[PDB]
C-alpha cells in the first residue's frame, strides 16, 4: 500500500504562481518524498507548462477533470488523448466541488472512471457526504452509493490503477471539524465496501490507497497517517505553497 500526498491546486493559482510552485516543488520534493508518492493537480490551463517543468522528476502530475472520450466534438471538455500526449496519466473524478457546483452525479463519475481505467489511466476518485446528509443519518447510504454506482462495471483487473479519497464535506467550512478517528471510521467503511464490490476483492481492498481529503496541514498530517486505513492526503490550501507542501513529507 502506497502513501500518497496529492496537492489539489483547484482554480486558486495564476499561471505565474503555478510555474513558481512547480519549480519549487521539483527542486525540493524529490529529495524529501522518500517512500511517499508526490502528486500535483494543476488547473488544466497550466498543465502543459507544469508538466514540462516536472518532466524527469518523481513528482506525478494529474488533471482535475476530463470527459469520457477520445478526441471528438465536446466543446469545453478535455480528452484523455490530450492529457496522454503531454504525459499526464492521472485524472481526478468526483471532487466535492464538481459534485456540488457542476452537478456531477455518481453515474457521470462512473462513465469517466470506466473510460479512464480502460485506457491505462490512474483515477483518483473522490467520495464524501454533506452536513445535511450526515445530520440525516445518510453517511453510510451516500458513501455506499458513491462507491457502488461510481465503480459499477469496472473490471477488477483495473483497480490497481484506482486511488480513493474521502472528503468530509460535512466538516468542510461548516464549521464542524473532523478528528482523525472520525476519518478513520469512514476509511475503514470505504475499504470494507471495496472488499464487497466483486468476487475476490479481498486483496485489492487491502492494497488500495484511501487518502484523506479534509483539512490537511503539516501540523496534523502525522496524526492522520497513524490511522490504520488512512493512506495519505488530497490536500487543498497547504499544497499551494512550497513551504506548507514540503512540510507534509
> Would you tell me which residues interact with a copy of itself (CB under 8 A)?
8, 10-16, 41, 43-49, 64-65, 67, 69, 71-79, 81-83, 85-86, 92, 95-98, 101-103, 236
CB 220 within 8 A of CB 177: no
Under DSSP, the state recorded for 153 is T
Q: What phi and psi values does residue 64 have, to the nearest 5 degrees? A: -75, -15
Q: Which is nearer to a copy of itself, 33 or 95 (CB)?
A: 95
Under DSSP, the state recorded for 136 is T
Q: Which is nearer to a copy of itself, 32 or 45 (CB)?
A: 45
Question: What minimum distance in Å lies between the beta carbon of 13 and a copy of itself?
Answer: 7
The residue count for the chain: 249
Question: What minimum distance in Å lies between the beta carbon of 79 and a copy of itself?
Answer: 5
How far, CA to CA in Å, does 138 sit from each of 99, 131, 146? 17, 10, 12
How far, CA to CA in Å, does 230 sit from each of 19, 63, 208, 214, 226? 30, 23, 11, 12, 7
CB 78 within 8 A of CB 48: no
Question: What minimum distance in Å lies between the beta carbon of 202 and a copy of itself?
Answer: 32
Question: What minimum distance in Å lies between the beta carbon of 46 and a copy of itself?
Answer: 7
Measure the CA–CA gap between 151 and 4, rounded to whole angstroms. 21
Backbone Cα Rg of the chain: 17
Q: Is 95 a catalytic residue?
A: yes
Q: Of the residues 46, 68, 129, 167, which is catalytic? A: 167
Q: Is 167 a catalytic residue?
A: yes
Q: Which residues belong to the active site?
A: 95, 167
Amino acid at each position: 500500500r502506497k502513501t500518497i500526498i496529492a496537492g489539489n491546486w483547484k482554480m486558486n493559482l495564476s499561471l505565474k504562481e503555478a510555474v513558481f510552485l512547480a519549480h519549487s516543488i521539483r527542486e525540493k520534493i524529490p529529495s524529501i518524498s522518500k517512500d511517499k508518492v508526490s502528486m500535483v493537480f494543476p488547473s488544466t490551463l497550466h498543465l502543459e507548462n507544469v508538466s514540462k517543468i516536472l518532466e524527469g522528476s518523481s513528482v506525478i502530475v494529474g488533471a482535475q477533470n476530463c470527459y469520457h472520450s477520445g478526441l471528438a466534438a465536446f466543446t469545453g471538455e478535455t480528452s484523455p488523448d490530450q492529457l496522454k500526449e503531454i504525459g499526464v496519466k492521472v485524472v481526478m473524478v468526483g471532487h466535492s466541488e464538481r459534485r456540488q457546483f457542476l452537478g456531477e452525479s455518481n453515474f457521470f463519475c462512473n462513465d469517466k472512471i470506466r473510460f479512464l481505467l480502460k485506457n491505462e489511466f490512474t483515477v483518483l476518485y473522490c467520495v464524501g457526504e454533506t452536513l445535511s446528509e450526515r445530520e440525516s443519518g445518510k453517511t453510510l447510504e451516500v458513501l455506499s452509493s458513491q462507491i457502488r454506482e461510481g465503480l459499477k462495471g469496472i473490471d477488477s483487473v483495473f483497480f490497481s490503477n484506482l486511488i480513493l479519497a474521502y472528503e468530509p464535506v460535512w466538516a468542510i467550512g461548516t464549521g464542524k471539524v473532523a478528528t482523525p478517528s472520525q476519518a478513520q471510521e469512514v476509511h475503514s467503511f470505504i475499504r470494507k465496501e471495496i472488499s464487497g464490490l466483486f468476487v475476490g476483492a479481498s486483496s485489492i481492498s487491502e492494497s488500495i490507497s484511501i487518502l484523506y481529503g479534509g483539512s490537511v496541514k503539516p501540523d496534523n498530517i502525522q496524526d492522520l497517517l497513524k490511522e490504520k486505513d488512512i493512506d495519505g492526503g488530497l490536500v487543498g490550501g497547504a499544497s499551494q505553497k512550497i513551504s506548507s507542501f514540503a512540510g507534509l513529507f
